[PDB]
Structure formats: C-alpha cells, structure tokens
Amino acid sequence: SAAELAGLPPKSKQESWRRKMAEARRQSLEAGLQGLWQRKVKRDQKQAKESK
Amino acid sequence: LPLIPKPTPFVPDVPTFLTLIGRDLKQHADKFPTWEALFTLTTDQLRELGVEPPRARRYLLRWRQRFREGKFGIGGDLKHVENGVAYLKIHEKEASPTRTSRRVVNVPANQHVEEVSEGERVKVKGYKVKGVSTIVGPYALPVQKGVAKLAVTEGMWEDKRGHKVDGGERRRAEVRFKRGVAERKALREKMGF
C-alpha cells in the first residue's frame, strides 16, 4: 500500500489486520513459488540424469 | 478456572439474565439456586437439571461465556438502574463557538445532567442523538423532551431465530393457495348458504 511504503502507522484495527494478511500472502507466495520451483528443478535433473 | 463475573446494575440476578437473552430460558430460573451456580454448572450438570432442548443449553453456555468476557448486549454498560429501569439523558458540550456535541448519558432519574460529575456521567454505547433533544437507539422509549427510559424486556439480548413465512420458498404458493381455498369455502357457509 502507498501508505505502508511511506512508513505511516495503521489507521485503525481493521487496516492493521489487512496489513498482516496482505504480508502473509506475500511471504507465502514468495516461499511458495521458490519452494515449488526447486522441486521442479530437482525433479527434472533426476529424470535427465537417469535417462542419460 | 471457572471464574465468576460480578453482577452488573442492569443484570443483578439470574432471573434478569435469563429474561434478557430470551429463548424462553426464564423457565429454568429455579434450577440455578444462586448467581454462582449459573457460572459454575457444566454441560453435564445443566443436562441433568433439565435445561433442554440441547439448543437452549448450548445457547445458555454461549451467553454465559459472553458475560464473562464482558460482551454484554445493549444497555449492559449502564450504571444507574432501579427496579430494572434506566433513564437516558443528553449531555451538551460546546465543541466550538458554532457547534455543540451531544452525548446520550445515563444518570439517576432525579439529578440533572449538568449536576452529575464526570465520574458518574456514564455514556451508554449504541445510543446517539438525532438533531436535538431526541435519543435514538434500540428499546429507547421517550419520557419527555431529552429523556428516554430503557427497561428490561423479554428477549432484549436475544439472537432471534429465523422464521418462515407461508412455509418458506418451496411451499409458498401452495400454502397461499390452500389458504385461499379455506377463505372462499368459509364465505359460502356465511353468505352462500
């Protein structure tokens, strides 16, 4: 949010929750895409290695 | 663990507590010998005393938890109640030379608003002032200009269960049809024959 980037505090208890939920979805999406990517690379290397 | 909350001026005893939450729970007002029994009996003990059906027992255990946490219904934050009746009055402050802030406060029925001190001038939540000298809020009946009473009523805090009209959506046209038959058939017996 433009307010979070500027460094402003939460306006109310509801926005504070929206900040935590939005951050939880950002942290999980980053850890999800990377975690699921290493699985693919680790799976393709094994196939390419055994098929060779 | 089973901490008991202290009674409040608006809910002083069990008969009042069971009268507010509704669901026809005031029937069992005699099962609980004291205020401490209500907040001490367990699920199994409430079942032996005869608090049934399970819907009423679970509903009671729920409101029993809300009272502990302080999640009262409407008017539960009052502080000056007498025989179950509380009077709401308006307190006016000059927020600016061209404005005025009005708050619905609860004070004794005799003392005037300006006479009461800040300590006893309680501000009830859920009630506001519309325009001037008008108190708006659930179960706020007017007594005079700038005054309204709030009396304990059956089901005042009740979570009313939903009810069907003419048997709901599926059986709406049929219940109205058959009902229309009973009407016409009645008129024939009155004026027809």
């Binding site: - | 030379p97 061209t98 005025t100 519309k130 325009g131 001037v132 000298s133 008008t134």
Partner: protein, 353 residues
C-alpha cells in the same frame, strides 16, 4: 399518506379562481400514476381522452382529466400564487397556504426564493402567526423551508412583535420564547431546512443560522423581558431560571458577535452584494425593521446583567448596542417618510406609538 389538497373556504371569488386554476391543472395531476400523467400532455392521446377522460377517485367522486396543451393551457404558477396571496383577508383564506404550498411542493415548482419572506409578512401582519409556525413544523409536507436568511429574520421579527404588542406579558412572552427556541432547534437539527441556497448564505456570513448573532438576539430579547419582571415560590424557582439563561445567552452572543461591529459590518463584505444573499439589509427601510428589537435587546440585557454584577458583559453589550445605535440612526435619516421601518423604529426604540 396525506389527504388530497382542497380549497373549500374562500371569502372572495377572485381567490377561488386562482386556487382552483392551480388545483385542477398543477396539483391534481400530481396524484395520478406516472404513466397516466404523461397522456394528459400528449397530443397523440387527445382523441382518446376526449371520449374516456382519465378519472381518479378522490372522495368517491371521480375527477376527470382531458387533454391539456402544455404550452397554451397551463397556468402561470408565480402569478396565480400572487393573485391568491393578495386576496386572502380572513383566517379561513390563509388556511389554504398549507394546502397550496403542499401542492406546489408535489409539482416540484421552484418558487421564487423570496416567496417565503412574503408569505410570512402578509400572513403574520394579519394575525396568523400560527399558520406559519404550523407549516414550518410540517415542513415534510408543505416544503416551507427556512433556507433564506431573510425568512428566518422575518419570522423572528413577528414572533417578537406579537409579544411586544402586549407589553411583554408573561403568558405571551413565555409563548414567544417557546417559538423562537423551536426555530433555532429546527435550524440546527431538522435536515429539511438545509439546501445549497442555505450553505451559500452560511458561507457568506460564516455563522450557521442557529448561531447567527442576529437570530440569537431574538432569544436574548424575550429572555431579557422575562427576568425584568422579577429579578409565589413557584414563580421564584422559575424566575431564577430565566437569569441563568440570560447570563448564558448573553455570554454566548458576545463571543460570536464581534466587537464594535453593527448589523451591516457583522457579516463578510461579500455577503451584502448578491441580491439573492443578504442584500435586503442595505435598504434603510429593512434595516430599521430588524435592528429595532435587536437594538432594544442589547440595551435591556446590558442593564439587567449589569445589576447582577457583571462588569465585562455590562460593557460588552453596551459596545454592540452603541454600534447598532450609531448605524440605526443613519438609517433613520436616509429612510423616506411614511415607510414601515421609520414607523417601527419610532415605535419600538422611540416609544412614541
């Protein structure tokens, strides 16, 4: 919800002509459904309406509607309202304003902004202040809103004159004080009285109507006239309450009304420019009309408050009174002879009767 408008009490044939003209072509069509109300003004249905004219059951007797040439047959609302308003001469006649203004409100007729100030004057001078106060209270129906700084200033002028006409007796001054407060409470709380025309005039004055020093001086006048009578135990418990308000209101007026500023310098300089916004105060005739009781109020309050031992207020109120008197005297010199203002000021302030 409400009963259909009707005009069944008219003392003159001219009045009945104007009221029945608007009724049968400007008011009654408003009671028809939105569809039928379109046929009456359509040539394509002129033939049909001639045979089976649209009917609506009011009081049983159906009211027939035929084709109406929207341009050639429709009457002029401003002129008809004038012909009726000028022919009203009896209480039975003015009772029609309640229904007339209701019908215009239903027809969405944007009446002249000054029309309210005129109805208040011609009606109150005839001795029908209640008919006005009743329409104001029933604003949800009559649309008689207090959105003009002049209407409120005109209405509060008569509410005092009726009390002053009886030498400020307790039975009447008590009644007037209830009316003045009912208006200041409607201006503040009731939302029917708010409009863009009012927000503009409140921006030019910078005081909301319910706080405008010119209107608060009315409530201060009647209050100052209740304490003067006594300042029986029941009366003492009440008389002692009037003094609490007198010092309360007086101490509030001085906070709003600036120092050494009269009625023409009270508001911003841009307020007296527009002819639709507080320009009436420029004419000496209309200035003396409103600066009479206001000048008399500050003087009276300044004396009582002084007796109670309030040095500041005793000097603050005399500061305004001295400012309004200096200006009021100018108007008394520029006003033409035989004018209403010159007579009122001469009677209220001059006390010549």
């Amino acid at each position: 919800t409400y009963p259909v408008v009707s005009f069944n009490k008219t003392s003159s044939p001219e009045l009945k002509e104007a009221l029945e003209t608007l009724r049968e072509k400007v008011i009654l069509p408003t009671y028809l459904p939105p569809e039928l109300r379109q046929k009456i003004f359509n040539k394509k249905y002129e033939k049909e309406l001639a045979h089976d004219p649209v009917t609506i059951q009011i009081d049983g007797q159906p009211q027939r509607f035929s084709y109406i040439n929207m341009l050639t047959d429709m009457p002029n609302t401003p002129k008809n309202i004038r012909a009726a308003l000028l022919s009203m001469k009896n209480g039975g006649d003015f009772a029609n304003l309640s229904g007339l203004l209701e019908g215009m409100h239903r027809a969405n007729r944007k009446l002249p902004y000054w029309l309210s100030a005129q109805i208040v004057r011609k009606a109150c001078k005839a001795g029908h202040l209640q008919l006005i106060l009743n329409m104001v209270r029933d604003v949800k129906r009559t649309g008689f809103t207090l959105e003009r700084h002049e209407t409120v200033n005109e209405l509060l002028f008569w509410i005092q004159r009726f009390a002053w006409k009886s030498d400020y007796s307790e039975p009447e001054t008590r009644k007037a004080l209830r009316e003045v407060q009912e208006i200041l409470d409607a201006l503040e709380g009731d939302e029917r009285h708010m409009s863009k025309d009012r927000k503009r005039q409140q921006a030019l004055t910078r005081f909301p109507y319910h706080r405008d020093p010119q209107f608060l001086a009315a409530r201060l006048n009647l209050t100052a006239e209740l304490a003067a009578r006594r300042a029986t135990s029941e009366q003492q418990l009440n008389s002692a309450n009037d003094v609490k308000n007198l010092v309360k209101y007086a101490e509030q007026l001085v906070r709003l009304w600036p120092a050494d500023k009269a009625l023409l310098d009270m508001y911003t300089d841009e307020a007296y420019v527009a002819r639709v916004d507080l320009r009436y105060l420029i004419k000496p005739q209309v200035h003396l009309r409103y600066a009479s009781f206001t000048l008399q109020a500050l003087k009276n309050a300044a004396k009582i408050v002084g007796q109670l031992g309030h040095g500041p207020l005793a000097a603050q109120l005399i500061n305004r009174a001295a400012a309004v008197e200096a200006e009021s005297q100018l108007a008394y010199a520029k006003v033409d002879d035989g004018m209403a203002g010159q007579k009122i000021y001469e009677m209220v302030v001059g006390g010549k009767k």
